[PDB]
Enzyme design. Structure first.
Site, PDB file in Angstrom:
ATOM      1  N   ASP A 185       0.866  -1.175   0.000  1.00 41.82           N
ATOM      2  CA  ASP A 185       0.000   0.000   0.000  1.00 41.82           C
ATOM      3  C   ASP A 185       0.909   1.233   0.000  1.00 41.82           C
ATOM      4  OD1 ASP A 185      -2.281  -1.799   0.890  1.00 41.82           O
ATOM      5  OD2 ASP A 185      -0.918  -1.863   2.630  1.00 41.82           O
ATOM      6  N   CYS A 219      -7.064  -2.445  -6.672  1.00 47.18           N
ATOM      7  CA  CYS A 219      -6.081  -2.603  -5.611  1.00 47.18           C
ATOM      8  C   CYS A 219      -6.923  -2.500  -4.347  1.00 47.18           C
ATOM      9  CB  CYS A 219      -4.989  -1.511  -5.684  1.00 47.18           C
ATOM     10  SG  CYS A 219      -5.468   0.208  -6.054  1.00 47.18           S
ATOM     11  N   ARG A 225      -2.126   2.251  -6.690  1.00 48.28           N
ATOM     12  CA  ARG A 225      -1.492   1.237  -7.516  1.00 48.28           C
ATOM     13  C   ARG A 225      -2.236   1.085  -8.872  1.00 48.28           C
ATOM     14  NH1 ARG A 225      -1.471  -2.613  -2.269  1.00 48.28           N
ATOM     15  NH2 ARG A 225      -3.237  -1.171  -1.894  1.00 48.28           N
ATOM     16  N   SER A 226      -3.565   1.145  -8.837  1.00 45.13           N
ATOM     17  CA  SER A 226      -4.340   1.020 -10.062  1.00 45.13           C
ATOM     18  C   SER A 226      -4.018   2.163 -10.997  1.00 45.13           C
ATOM     19  CB  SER A 226      -5.853   1.023  -9.772  1.00 45.13           C
ATOM     20  OG  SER A 226      -6.261  -0.169  -9.111  1.00 45.13           O
ATOM     21  N   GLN A 266      -0.908   7.773  -5.849  1.00 41.64           N
ATOM     22  CA  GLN A 266      -0.920   8.378  -4.535  1.00 41.64           C
ATOM     23  C   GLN A 266       0.378   8.874  -3.910  1.00 41.64           C
ATOM     24  OE1 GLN A 266      -3.682   9.049  -2.002  1.00 41.64           O
ATOM     25  NE2 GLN A 266      -4.145   9.637  -4.129  1.00 41.64           N
TER      26      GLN A 266
HETATM   27  O1  213 Z   1     -10.073  15.431  -0.473  1.00 42.54           O
HETATM   28  P1  213 Z   1      -9.630  15.497  -1.940  1.00 42.54           P
HETATM   29  O2  213 Z   1     -10.878  15.780  -2.769  1.00 42.54           O
HETATM   30  O3  213 Z   1      -8.628  16.538  -2.189  1.00 42.54           O
HETATM   31  C1  213 Z   1      -8.978  13.864  -2.450  1.00 42.54           C
HETATM   32  C2  213 Z   1      -8.762  13.653  -3.825  1.00 42.54           C
HETATM   33  C3  213 Z   1      -8.254  12.413  -4.274  1.00 42.54           C
HETATM   34  C4  213 Z   1      -7.967  11.393  -3.349  1.00 42.54           C
HETATM   35  C5  213 Z   1      -8.167  11.564  -1.965  1.00 42.54           C
HETATM   36  C6  213 Z   1      -7.869  10.513  -0.825  1.00 42.54           C
HETATM   37  C7  213 Z   1      -6.630   9.851  -0.898  1.00 42.54           C
HETATM   38  C8  213 Z   1      -6.231   8.885   0.072  1.00 42.54           C
HETATM   39  C9  213 Z   1      -7.134   8.611   1.128  1.00 42.54           C
HETATM   40  C10 213 Z   1      -6.695   7.511   2.201  1.00 42.54           C
HETATM   41  C11 213 Z   1      -7.768   6.443   2.715  1.00 42.54           C
HETATM   42  C12 213 Z   1      -8.303   5.547   1.492  1.00 42.54           C
HETATM   43  C13 213 Z   1      -7.127   4.877   0.559  1.00 42.54           C
HETATM   44  C14 213 Z   1      -6.486   3.481   1.026  1.00 42.54           C
HETATM   45  C15 213 Z   1      -5.506   2.934   0.251  1.00 42.54           C
HETATM   46  C16 213 Z   1      -5.041   3.545  -0.933  1.00 42.54           C
HETATM   47  C17 213 Z   1      -4.019   3.004  -1.761  1.00 42.54           C
HETATM   48  F1  213 Z   1      -3.330   4.054  -2.387  1.00 42.54           F
HETATM   49  F2  213 Z   1      -3.127   2.325  -1.112  1.00 42.54           F
HETATM   50  P2  213 Z   1      -4.521   1.985  -3.218  1.00 42.54           P
HETATM   51  O4  213 Z   1      -3.279   1.571  -3.927  1.00 42.54           O
HETATM   52  O5  213 Z   1      -5.225   0.786  -2.710  1.00 42.54           O
HETATM   53  O6  213 Z   1      -5.363   2.932  -4.112  1.00 42.54           O
HETATM   54  C18 213 Z   1      -5.615   4.792  -1.342  1.00 42.54           C
HETATM   55  C19 213 Z   1      -6.640   5.424  -0.587  1.00 42.54           C
HETATM   56  C20 213 Z   1      -6.976   5.439   3.747  1.00 42.54           C
HETATM   57  C21 213 Z   1      -5.572   5.541   4.009  1.00 42.54           C
HETATM   58  C22 213 Z   1      -4.923   4.656   4.882  1.00 42.54           C
HETATM   59  C23 213 Z   1      -5.670   3.645   5.527  1.00 42.54           C
HETATM   60  C24 213 Z   1      -7.055   3.517   5.303  1.00 42.54           C
HETATM   61  C25 213 Z   1      -7.710   4.410   4.413  1.00 42.54           C
HETATM   62  N1  213 Z   1      -8.964   7.038   3.420  1.00 42.54           N
HETATM   63  N2  213 Z   1     -10.189   7.038   2.805  1.00 42.54           N
HETATM   64  N3  213 Z   1     -10.946   7.640   3.726  1.00 42.54           N
HETATM   65  C26 213 Z   1     -10.357   8.038   4.885  1.00 42.54           C
HETATM   66  C27 213 Z   1     -10.783   8.669   6.027  1.00 42.54           C
HETATM   67  C28 213 Z   1      -9.856   8.936   7.075  1.00 42.54           C
HETATM   68  C29 213 Z   1      -8.493   8.556   6.937  1.00 42.54           C
HETATM   69  C30 213 Z   1      -8.057   7.905   5.753  1.00 42.54           C
HETATM   70  C31 213 Z   1      -8.969   7.643   4.709  1.00 42.54           C
HETATM   71  C32 213 Z   1      -8.340   9.234   1.227  1.00 42.54           C
HETATM   72  C33 213 Z   1      -8.708  10.190   0.249  1.00 42.54           C
HETATM   73  C34 213 Z   1      -8.681  12.821  -1.516  1.00 42.54           C
HETATM   74 CL    CL Z   2      -4.475  12.865  -4.730  1.00 38.36          CL
END
Ligand code: 213
Ligand code: CL
Length: 287
Positions: A185, A219, A225-226, A266
């Site tokens: 991740d 993913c 990753r996707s 990411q």
């Molecule tokens: O707020 P914006 O509009 O600017 C915006 C725009 C684009 C993306 C995000 C945006 C980007 C990242 C997150 C992190 C994530 C989900 C996420 C998980 C794995 C992967 C990965 F990269 F590993 P994979 O390879 O599987 O994709 C990518 C995203 C999260 C992070 C760590 C653990 C659990 C959840 N998450 N989701 N909701 C959450 C609430 C509280 C804390 C963390 C939270 C959220 C939003 C925000």
């Molecule tokens: Cl982003």
């Protein structure tokens, strides 16, 4: 045509000046913003793996089922490259049925999984496919049956042959499952070579051909990753179709992709990795 000696020195340059974070951050803050009203309706709450990751309404995949048509999945359509992909999240216990329903309706031939059922403690994804030939899975809700036919396990990835059967029309199709097993991740692949190898395997299988529906890529959240995987594939296609590879601007390509699904790629390092992978890969193909 040592024109590659330029791209590579250009890379060493960015690498040298440590400009990757800046390049990546700039892309993040320039990315499209579109509504995601459907993903946020109360009834779809339990269909989202993460609170802050959602498919845009305009590009979301709709389930042809009657009841609820929602699934956290997005269709990415690249005009020039002439390739389409469906990016979705790692299936949830209650959405495995929806997942395979989408694979069927969209007529996909392949599924590309880049995460692991268990990541850094606590299963960050449901086991949506059969692990044993003799223990096929039946999805009550969408009325589908899935059977593992064979699998070839390798060091950093596994290729599986599955049979998906629509129990209503009694039709059956062969689905190829490409699972890259060593991509952490928020991390990068074990190496450029492993990555390109996995990608070429996906390509030569014909799973990405226009004959079939779009390949389903996922993913955990379906964006990091996707996004790296698809950005790389698409950029490789463009370097081959452009009379001049250097004309491929990865920054623009990612922004284009980000119009269909939020947050693709990411970390600054994944962006860098995708670049490296594209150059190495191009050099290989243009040999
Ligand atoms: O707020 P914006 O509009 O600017 C915006 C725009 C684009 C993306 C995000 C945006 C980007 C990242 C997150 C992190 C994530 C989900 C996420 C998980 C794995 C992967 C990965 F990269 F590993 P994979 O390879 O599987 O994709 C990518 C995203 C999260 C992070 C760590 C653990 C659990 C959840 N998450 N989701 N909701 C959450 C609430 C509280 C804390 C963390 C939270 C959220 C939003 C925000
Ligand atoms: Cl982003």
């Amino acid at each position: 045509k040592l024109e590659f000696m330029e791209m590579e020195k250009e890379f060493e340059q960015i690498d040298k000046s440590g400009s990757w974070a800046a390049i990546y951050q700039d892309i993040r803050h320039e990315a499209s913003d579109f509504p995601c009203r459907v993903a946020k309706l109360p009834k779809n709450k339990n269909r989202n793996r993460y609170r802050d990751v959602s498919p845009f309404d305009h590009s979301r995949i709709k389930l042809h089922q009657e009841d609820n048509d929602y699934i956290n999945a997005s269709l990415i359509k690249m005009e020039e490259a002439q390739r389409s992909y469906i990016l979705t999240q790692g299936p949830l216990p209650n959405t495995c049925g929806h997942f395979w329903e989408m694979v069927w309706e969209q007529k996909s031939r392949g599924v590309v999984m880049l995460n692991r059922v268990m990541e850094k403690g606590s299963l960050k994804c449901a086991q949506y496919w059969p692990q044993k030939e003799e223990k096929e899975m039946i999805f009550e809700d969408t009325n589908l049956k899935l059977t593992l036919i064979s699998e070839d396990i390798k060091s950093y990835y596994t290729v599986r042959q599955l049979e998906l059967e629509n129990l209503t029309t009694q039709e059956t199709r062969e689905i190829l499952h490409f699972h890259y097993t060593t991509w952490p991740d928020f991390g990068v692949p074990e190496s450029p070579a492993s990555f390109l190898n996995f990608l070429f395997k996906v390509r030569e299988s014909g799973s990405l051909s226009p004959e079939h529906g779009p390949v389903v890529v996922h993913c955990s959240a379906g964006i990091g990753r996707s996004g790296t995987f698809c950005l790389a594939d698409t950029c490789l296609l463009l370097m081959d179709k452009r009379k001049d590879p250097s004309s491929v601007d990865i920054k623009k390509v990612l922004l284009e992709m980000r119009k269909f699904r939020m947050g693709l790629i990411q970390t600054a390092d994944q962006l860098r990795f995708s670049y490296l992978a594209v150059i190495e890969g191009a050099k290989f193909i243009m040999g």
